[PDB]
């Protein structure tokens with residue numbers, strides 16, 4: 001179902017955001 | 031169902047992350 005795809009998009013989006021925040025933390029030494 | 035709560039937690043988490051990234055962008059003038 002297309003509902004599964006939207007849940008997968010949310011999961012992917014949260015991973016991308018978490019990984020961005022992680023990279024920023026490593027940049028500013030945190 | 032508890033499934034609804036977990037989907038709500040994901041949505042909330044993505045909003046919190048998006049808002050953090052937005053605040054960081056405003057800080058560094060972007």
Ligand code: NA
Pocket residue numbers: 012015016
């Ligand atoms: Na990903």
Ligand code: NA
Pocket residue numbers: 015018019
């Ligand atoms: Na992650």
Ligand code: NA
Pocket residue numbers: 042045046
């Ligand atoms: Na929120």
Ligand code: NA
Pocket residue numbers: 045048049
């Ligand atoms: Na938002």
